[PDB]
Each structure stands twice: as C-alpha cells, then as structure tokens.
C-alpha cells in the first residue's frame, strides 16, 4: 500500500584492477539520491566535490591526515589485500558451459550456466562458417555467478544439411561443438 | 580494464533500512545480515575459502545513517526520484518438460532499494523454493536485484513475476510460459 | 580462510 518521500545515501569503494594487480585504482564514492557528491580517487590522491552538495565534505576530509594517509595506502592494504584473498575463487572461477541446439524457420544455440563472462559463439554449415544474420541476445548475468546467452541463425534448412554450433570459453582448452541435422 | 571489487553500502532514511555488501564484477560475494549481524556468503564455498569479521562494517552503516541525516538537511529535504525497474524473466537452463529447472526474475535499473516480489503459478502466489539476492550496485547508482523460483516445467502452467515499485503505477507482471 | 578487509566510512562534518 501507499507511501512517502524517500532519502538515500550510498557509499561504495571500488577497487579496480589492471593486468593482475600491477596497476590499481581505488575509487571512493558518495551518492545522495542518485547524485554522486564527493569522491576519493587514488590517482588524484584527495577528495573532490563532484557537486556543490559535496563541497564541504571534501574540504573537511582533505583537512585530516590519517584519513588521507589511510585512503592513499588503501590501494595496497585494502584493494591488493582483498584481491589476494579472493583471487582463487573469483579471478580463477571456471564453470564450463552447457550447450543445446533446436528450432523455435530459425535456429537456437543455447549456452548456459558458465563463468567468467567472456565467450564466443560461432555458427557452422557443413564446415563453412556463417556470418550473415547471426542474431545474438547478447550476454546475460544470472545473479549467481553463472551466465547465459542465446544465438540464432535465420536459415531454412534443407534435408541432409549439418548445422553445427561452436562455443569457446576459457574453462575448456578445447572448443565445445554441438551439431544439428534436418 | 580487467576486475572490480566494490564495497557497496546504502542507508535508506524513513524505512530505516540498510545494507553492507561486496561486489566482484557485479556478483555478490557476501552481504551482512543486519538483523542477525553475521556474514552471509553468496555461495557456501566462499565461506570455506575466506572468512570475514563484520564488526567494522556494522559501524559503517551507523555512520552512513548519521551521514544521510545530515545530507537530508543540507539538501533542503530533497527527496529521491523514483526510478521504475526493468523486469525481464528467463529460465536457468534449457526448459525441458518435467526436469528440475529455475526461473530468474531480473530486477534491473531501479532506485529506491525497495521491492515486493511475488511469483504466481497460474495466478496463485507460491513461496516454497524461493530465494533471492539483495540489492546490487550499478555504475549509474541504480540497483540490480534477483529472485529465483525453482520448478518442474509443465505444458499447463503460466508463471508471472510480480514486482511492486513506487516507479510503477501498477505491479509489473511478467509472463513466462513454456513456448 | 583469510579475512576480507574493509575501509571505514568517513563521517561528514557535524551540523
């Protein structure tokens, strides 16, 4: 049922990681009602009003040594440290795709239940690869550390014909292929 | 780039509601149960490969609260603008008849972190099997959320994911049938 | 296993 004016504050600390942990950036962020208002960015090394609402938070935070010294070490003591704790089950999580094919005249390659997001999926007709009119719903994040996507091929089959779906993913050293015949 | 671990907090003023959670490429590692004051890992295993002592995070929320009340005043009691979610719904795996499978309700791109979610097997609410993620951050600062309902697929049943938000004027129902 | 670390909220300045 009914209700009234809402007021919201967010604090997010983002650790961003390039090339292992060779380059690291911390982004500290405050949001009031969908308006970022002040931040700390380790590559800037001090707080900035993002808007005038945040102006006095910057001035005050910047006036404090330990706050500043802490954030400026965060890149090592907080980001790098937690990369280290999470690495083996996050950076190195491998869950292998499950594939199927079918018609819904159109064609479906369903790729599901897999993890990390990057994936490539190509369509094959007797061996020769098919570029034209691959429809691809794009990549979908399931909420539970597994992804899925669907790739369609618009082709009316003829009899004989062997359409094959190739799938490639860093959890399998070899490509996963799954064929269909009319 | 390559990776991103977000420590995400909110506190939501009148509802007196809060969250402390860790993100990794937009996947919850764990959150804290404010009621219970204990770590809740997103998947069991995480708890066997890391631990987490939660005392600091609990205080963080209290500070986020005090902080919110000051902003509320400084901002001249400017309230947030409701932003309706985009509710898609699709299945876990290839829905083959009479084989255990799961339905996902994606609640994306919405603000204030408040939603009633209800599933509807033929138009009759069902809460046996359900679980759900908590509120997940996004770059724009809106929120992501996920609800699951596991089931046996049939030729018979319609399902709807019924989400309620102050963006929408009426609950968004999204139909899933086995086509 | 090993402990995940946090960073603590900076308090905004008082009214």
């Amino acid at each position: 049922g009914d209700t009234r004016p809402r007021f919201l504050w967010q604090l997010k600390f983002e650790c961003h990681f390039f090339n292992g942990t060779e380059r690291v950036r911390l982004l500290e962020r405050c949001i009031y009602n969908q308006e970022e208002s002040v931040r700390f960015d380790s590559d800037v090394g001090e707080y900035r009003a993002v808007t005038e609402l945040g102006r006095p938070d910057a001035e005050y935070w910047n006036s404090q040594k330990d706050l500043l010294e802490q954030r400026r070490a965060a890149v090592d003591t907080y980001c790098r440290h937690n990369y280290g704790v999470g690495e083996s089950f996050t950076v190195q999580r491998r869950v292998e795709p499950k594939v199927t094919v079918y018609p819904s005249n159109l064609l479906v390659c369903s790729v599901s239940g897999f993890y990390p997001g990057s994936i490539e999926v190509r369509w094959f007709r007797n061996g020769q690869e098919e570029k034209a009119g691959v429809v691809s719903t794009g990549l979908i994040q399931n909420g539970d550390w597994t992804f899925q996507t669907l790739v369609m091929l618009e082709t009316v089959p003829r009899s004989g014909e062997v359409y094959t779906c190739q799938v490639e993913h860093p959890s399998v050293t070899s490509p996963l292929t799954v064929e269909w015949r009319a | 780039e390559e990776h991103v671990i977000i420590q995400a907090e909110f506190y939501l003023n009148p509802d007196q509601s809060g969250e402390f959670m860790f993100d990794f490429d937009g996947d919850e590692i764990f959150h804290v149960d404010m009621a219970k004051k204990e770590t809740v890992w997103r998947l069991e295993e995480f708890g066997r490969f890391a631990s987490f002592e939660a005392q600091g995070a609990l205080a963080n929320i209290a500070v986020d609260k005090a902080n919110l009340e000051i902003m509320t005043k400084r901002s001249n009691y400017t309230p947030i603008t409701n932003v309706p979610p985009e509710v898609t719904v699709l299945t876990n795996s290839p829905v083959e008849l009479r084989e255990p499978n799961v339905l996902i309700c994606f609640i994306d791109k919405f603000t204030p972190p408040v939603v009633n979610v209800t599933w509807l097997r033929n138009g009759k609410p069902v809460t046996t099997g359900v679980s759900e993620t908590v509120f997940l951050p996004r770059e724009d600062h809106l929120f992501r959320k996920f609800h699951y309902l596991p089931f046996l697929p049939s030729t018979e049943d319609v399902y709807d994911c019924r989400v309620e938000h102050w963006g929408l004027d009426e609950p968004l129902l999204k139909h899933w049938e086995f086509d | 296993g090993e402990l995940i670390g946090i960073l603590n909220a900076a308090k905004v300045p008082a009214d």
Partner: T-cell receptor
Amino acid sequence: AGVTQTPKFRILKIGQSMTLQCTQDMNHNYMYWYRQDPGMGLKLIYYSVGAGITDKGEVPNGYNVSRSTTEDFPLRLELAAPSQTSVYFCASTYHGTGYFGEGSWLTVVE
Amino acid sequence: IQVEQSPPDLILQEGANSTLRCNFSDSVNNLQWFHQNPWGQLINLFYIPSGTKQNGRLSATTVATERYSLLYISSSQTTDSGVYFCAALIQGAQKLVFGQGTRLTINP
C-alpha cells in the same frame, strides 16, 4: 586533548567494584580497553566499533563495558579478584593514529 | 592473527643508530609504532601504512606489500629508552593489536 581516562590510581578491595571512565573528543568510533601486566604485552579486554556496539577481547572475564555514546567507553570490574591487579589503558583511533590515555594503575587488596 | 617484532632486546651506546623491525600476518594491517617510556606512558610515533615518514631522529618505512615495517633511530638518546611496540588493525574486525615489543636501552 586526545584520550583522557580516570583514576590514574585506584585501590580496590577484594570483591568490591568500580568503573574506569574513558573519554575522547576526537570523534573516534573505535575505542578499546587493555590491561598490561608489568613487563608484559597489552592484552585486550573489550573493544567497541561505535555507539551501542561492543565485543569481547582476548580476556573479557570479570569485566564489563558499555557504549551509549561515541565519546565514552566506561569499563566496569564487578568483583575485584586479585588477578585484576594490573595497569589498564584506554585507546581510540579511527582512520589512522592510535591514541592512549595516560593509564590506570589499579591494585586490588585483601 | 599476529604481529612479530624483531629484536626482542637491544642495548646501544647513545649516538648509535637503531633498526627495529616488525612482520605481520595477512590478517592485520595499517601499521603503527609506539614508544612506551619507562613510566609507562604510551606515545604514538607514526601511523605508517605504506612508504616512508620521518620525524626528527625517527623514520619508518612500511612495505605494505610485504608485511613489514622498519623503525630507524638516528643518534639515539638515553631518553629513548623503553619498549617499542608495532601495532596493527585486524582486517574487518577492527581490533587494534600489538607485537611483543622490543626493550630498548640506550646507555650514556
């Protein structure tokens, strides 16, 4: 002013009881009580991450503590046992530096 | 867990330099150094999470990514006598936590 704790000095009868005050004006949310036996390490008794939150240290027994306000962390000894003759120290910090009060030398007697 | 102070005792003639040392578990961080003078007052010397800070006769380096800090002391004075503790915070828990110390004696 940093951290200020009082009785710098107390004599406390066996079985009697007592409260050390510890007060800090720097807005620290994190505060802690330690005891230190002479020539020894600081051992943590109790600590508090903010208002209304507290947690047992490595030796919380025979002691008790409250935090209704950011500024104060009193520490209560209920039932003075002789094993509680020690030096007690209050500290606060938050983003960085640790600050210690001038200490409290408690001796418990028969 | 823990904080492991290198030398458990150190005795030097005034004017000498001192290196004190502290290694610490991946469970704690944000490393500080204190001086406990011999009337037991607990002085803070540095907050020193990472890198170098210097303060008159004292400087400290923390190699955050390797879990050790060095406290150096030029031209030590007899008054620097007492015990030195490296302290640190448990990650998440916010427990301030202490090595065993180093007794320092500076002889006139």
